[PDB]
Amino acid sequence: THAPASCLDTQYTCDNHQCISKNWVCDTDNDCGDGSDEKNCNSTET
Ligand SMILES: [Ca+2]
Numbered sequence: 001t002h003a004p005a006s007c008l009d010t011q012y013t014c015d016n017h018q019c020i021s022k023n024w025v026c027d028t029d030n031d032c033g034d035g036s037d038e039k040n041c042n043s044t045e046t
Pocket of ligand 1: 031
């Protein structure tokens with residue numbers, strides 16, 4: 001019994017509850033607007 005996450009399976013759930021592609025997460029461009037997809041990442045890209 002798997003628990004279905006928010007948004008699509010291949011989608012990411014931003015802090016703003018936005019549903020973007022998981023391939024957009026931490027791609028050095030804020031997709032969620034608030035940039036939560038970029039904030040949830042561990043790299044010194046600045
Ligand atoms: Ca992004």
